[PDB]
Amino acid sequence: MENFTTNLNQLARVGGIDPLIGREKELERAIQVLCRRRKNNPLLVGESGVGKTAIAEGLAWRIVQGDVPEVMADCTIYSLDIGSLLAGTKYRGDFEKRFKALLKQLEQDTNSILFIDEIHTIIGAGAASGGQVDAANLIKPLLSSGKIRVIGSTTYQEFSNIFEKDRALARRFQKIDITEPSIEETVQIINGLKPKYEAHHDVRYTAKAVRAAVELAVKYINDRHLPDKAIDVIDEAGARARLMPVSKRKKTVNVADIESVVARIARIPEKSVSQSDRDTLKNLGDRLKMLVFGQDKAIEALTEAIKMARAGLGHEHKPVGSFLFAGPTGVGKTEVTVQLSKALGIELLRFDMSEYMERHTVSRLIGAPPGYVGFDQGGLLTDAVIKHPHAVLLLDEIEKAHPDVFNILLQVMDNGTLTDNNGRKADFRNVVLVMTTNAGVRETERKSIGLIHQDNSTDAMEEIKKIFTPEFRNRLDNIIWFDHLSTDVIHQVVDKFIVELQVQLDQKGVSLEVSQEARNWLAEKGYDRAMGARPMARVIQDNLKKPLANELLFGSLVDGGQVTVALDKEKNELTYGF
Template sequence: MQVLCRRRKNNPLLVGEAGVGKTAIAEGLAWRIVEGQVPEVIQDCVIYSLDIGSLLAGTKYRGDFEKRFKNILKQLEKEDHAILFIDEIHTIIGAGAASGGQVDAANLIKPLLSNGKLRCMGSTTYQEYSNIFEKERALSRRFQKIDIVEPSLDDTTKILMGLKPKYEAHHEVRFTNKAIRAAVELSAKYINERHLPDKAIDVIDEAGARCRLAPASRRKKTVNVSDIEAMIAKMARIPEKSVSSSDRDVLQKLDSKLKMLVFGQDPAIDVLTEAIKLSRAGLGAENKPVGSFLFAGPTGR
């Protein structure tokens, strides 16, 4: 909101990994404006979302896209309190440009951004920002970059608690508070290729859908921790027993289980398990690997 209130360069650019809530921030701002929960200076603002795909659809001839986009910009320019939101804003670079031409959506919007006649919010990922958007210096300098980091476990839990009534009404089930917390913690632990809160939301959504699809005679009315564990195991493609077991139990028996599978290498196993236990205890550096090991020896040992 502070960036939107600036006199110049009042165009915030939300940059973060997919699933961390960039679009949700823009939607949340729109909701707060409607509810009157914003400072007086932006109480009269209206946020418009631009769909580049719809603008490009059906543009057969050169100039069709430019005409459509210019009409939208003219209309927004007439409104004193309009804010344009462009999700995946890197897509405007090159959008609508004819073969060999330089007139694209980015070049059409630049003049309005430079003279302050239009406020624009955008969102993109770090990869698209560095590979595409940042290289368009004339456009990127008109925006104020805001890094959107992945929320913590506690913040994600609060987000899911706020969303819980909507998913309960949709799936006609009840999520326990422990199930919500388990969805956050287990998704953060086992689903590594995605980010919070998106992956935790998907877990409770899938768990609710699974309960609703069950036959009426076996349909559960409450989603508990065991249901979340089963869904995490399915999504992460790991044995369900691995999810339900506590770290303490697994780590206590780790060296003995390895020694039952690998014989005659007790010193090496002890070094390996000690490094893992130190890491899980939080004594290792977060930005460094758990350990780097070189297993040297003759073939067959």
């Protein structure tokens, strides 16, 4: 074993092992397990960057230090150098005789415990040479007999794949759940390790920089657990401090340097890591009101809800907001969503829910179950969000979706996250969810019977309440009802459409001047309360685009030119010569 295992107690004695910070109950449970006559091999199961191996070293520390009960005190914990044993490759030869010599030494020394890091190498495998397969068979009886004790270390995903697949181990090993440490513990870990970073980079860190690395990393870096993400921030700040200021060589790293690395590590703007886009938010109300006309209460309701979330009033685990838009057709319920994402400078992730009417949508949005082609995808939704954690997410015409999509939505609205079918998860805390529906467009054309007409309209919202059950509705921030467009709005609508026509004409060298009377005339011709603005587009196309097309192709506007439109007393469009 002398060239196969490392005496961890010796590392603790020489200084290879540092004292563990916190984790008192983790060490106590490992010893409670080791002392059992059945199922006495503890396994540390967790996630990368939480101290799983630091804890096993930490136990050797306490065994040496004298911080454990006399039963454990002075026992010896050794790690297993898997690489050294596998290196025997040519082969065994010495692989098997030395492994057996190890077991004989350990069997004889019942005061010996092995620590096996990266336990999934052997358990559920052993495939590294195959030598670990019968090595496991020669370990199992000694774990059972109480001759050899083993402390393992793996992750949750491997645990299920390696230990839950073998009854012999299910009956021999005890899982211990290892979570990340606290903010204070993380700072203590960094300060414990710190001289190793300062010496490496020829930098020094302030106390504040260390605290900031831990807290800023939590706020913006959502990829890892605290020990490592905060350490990476410290190391990255160290690395840039020794790199960037070639002409200045500032030696001390402060919180300002931490903010710059957190912004880059976290993929967020260098401004946003600290200073918010207060002006972007202040200007949403006006920028959106200048694009979609007539929906003033709707724009404000959306804008205010976003601001409250951005002001920090709400829950940190939830999406930025969740709103269902509804109303008559041709009113801008999708147009405003598109403009929202532009106004905020945020990429729009868009799904047409009419493409998910079947029972085969889960397999696309979440990912196919393992064994199915497409299980390899993280889900179209999951992947879009992971790539773009800051996003406006639009689910167009949600009422057409197969009902299973609602379970996906309910989970996200409650926890801010969606896992894939492989282990990754999307973080929706930075996206805005907008769903639209046309349930509320249902209406009639029939009037009352009598000489004097009266308004016989029904109560809007009933069409939503009957489709979307309370579980869904009660999790929305709101339902924004959009109204019908008025005639004043139509005049504004005509103007934006005339502008679009001019842009197309500029490309051909043609200048179009429509008179005010002509505009008032078109506005009247296209007004239809029940069809929103879509008829205005038709009216403009029919009255202006049509004769222009003939001239552009066959006549006077081939080489560019001047076009104007006057209104006749006869209500004709007196188009201009050229």
